[model samples]
Target: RTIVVTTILESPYVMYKKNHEQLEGNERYEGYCVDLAYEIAKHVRIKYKLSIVGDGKYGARDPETKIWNGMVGELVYGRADIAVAPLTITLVREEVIDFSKPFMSLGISIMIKKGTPIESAEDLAKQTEIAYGTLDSGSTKEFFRRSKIAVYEKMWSYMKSAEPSVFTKTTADGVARVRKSKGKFAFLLESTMNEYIEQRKPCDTMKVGGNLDSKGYGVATPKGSALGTPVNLAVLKLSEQGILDKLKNKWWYDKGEC
Candidate 1:
C-alpha cells in the first residue's frame, strides 16, 4: 500500500512550487519536507503520496473535548499514514501519536513590524497598546494557552480575552496583520518561519528577542505504526550524512532575497 504522507502548507517546509500549476500530482509541491520525504521514500523503499492537511492546522487537541484536530487528527483517525512537515513535537501531541527523533530544531519566536515598539512577549503582555497573538491552530498558540509560567500565563489571559479577537487562523494571516497593524501588533511563531520571512522581499518584519520556548520538528505517524522504526532510522541516517543540513541550506539560504 502506498503511504499517504500528510503535511501542512507552511513556508520553507512544504509549499507549492513556482510552476506548481503546470505540475501534476506530487510534482506540484516542493520544500524542505518534500525533499526530506523524497529521501525517506528512497531509503525506506516505500511508495508514498504527499497530501496537505484538510483543516490547514498544524494540529491541536481541543481543550474541553480533548479531541485531536488537523494533521495530527488525520493520523490518529487513520486518514493518513504519516506526516512529514514542520510539525513540532509536543507532550500533548505525543500522547496520541508517535514522533521520530527531531529532524529539525527550532523554537517559538516573536515577529513584529520593523519599527514596532514591541521587543518581546513581556512588552506585549505588559500593555494593551499593541496587539499580539500566535497562529490559532498550532503549537505556538497552545504553548501560551497552557503555560503556567507567569509571563506566558499573563500573556495568554490578555490574548484569550482581547477585544476584537487577536487569534489568527493561519501564519500568513498573522504576518499580514502585523504588516498592516501600523506598529500596533506583534506575532508569535516559530523562529524558522520568522527567519524565512525576514529574508523575503519587502522584508518589513523582524524576529526580536530570544525564542520563547525550545523545541523541534519531527516526522509523525500513528501510535505504534509499523513505518515508525524505518522512518526514524531514515532521519538518523540523513542527519548523520548531513543531508538534512544541506536541504535546509537549499530551501532557506540559497533562495533567500534578503
Candidate 2:
C-alpha cells in the first residue's frame, strides 16, 4: 500500500535519530532528502515508507562481478519503489535505471584532519605524510577508481593495495575515521558534505579543492516507474518556490565555514 524510498545516514542528507525506530511514517527520520521525499510523494499522489539501504552507502557497481549493491540493487530487484537519496545520474547508471532532474549539484572534494600540512588535492596526491581514500560506493570512490587523470590514477593505484581500514564503506564512516585518525587518512567525498562537516565544532576537517568534478544528484526509480514524471515536476516546482534554496541554507550552510 506504500512506496519505499532508499536513503543513507549521512548528516544534512539522511541519518538515523537515536530514537528513529520509535517514530512512524516519514516522521520516523528527517533530513534534506527526507523532506524532498515528502514533497515528491505529495506531487506523485503516493504515500511512502523511508527504507534505509543495506550498506548505508550510495549505490555502486562491482568492477569484478558487475553486480550493483545498495540502493542500486534495491531498485534493480524491485525492492524499492524509488530512491530519494543522492544517487548520481551517471552514464552507467542511466543504462539500468531512471533518474529525475537534478535536485542538487556537487563535486568531488577532499577532507583532511586538522593541523595537517596538506591544503589541496595536489598536496594530497603528492604528499607522503597524509594519505587519502573515499567512500566505497559513492561517486568520489568511482571517480578515483576509474579516473584517467594522472594524479588520481596514481592515487587509486596506491589505495587499492592499502590495508582494510584504509578504504571505507561509506562517506560518514570515512569522515568519522578521519576525525579520529592520527593525521594520516583524508577522505574524498561530495563538496557539499565536506563543506557541511567542516562547520561543526571540533572542526578538524576542511575541504581542499574547488571540486575535482561537477555533477548533479537525482532521484532514481526503477525503469518506467509511473512516479518519475510527477516527481521531476515537483522538484522543478520546489526550485521555483525557493523550497530547495531554503533546504540548502537550513541543512547545508546555516553555520557557514568552520
lDDT of each: 0.91, 0.81
Candidate 1 lDDT tens digits, 96-118: 99999999999999999998887
Span of ten consecutive residues with least summed lDDT in model 1: 116-125
What stretches of model 1 exceed 4 Å from their correct place? none
Global lDDT of model 1: 0.91
lDDT (C-alpha) at residue 7 in model 1: 90
Question: For residues 111-223, could you state the per-residue lDDT of candidate 2 as single tens digits?
Answer: 87877677777777786667778777667777887899898888888787877646777667888889888687888888888888998878788887578898998899888
| CA RMSD, predictions in order | 1.2, 1.9
Q: How accurate is candidate 2 locally (lDDT)?
A: 0.81
User: For residue 146, what is the lDDT in candidate 1?
Assistant: 84
What TM-score, to 2 decimals, does candidate 2 have? 0.93
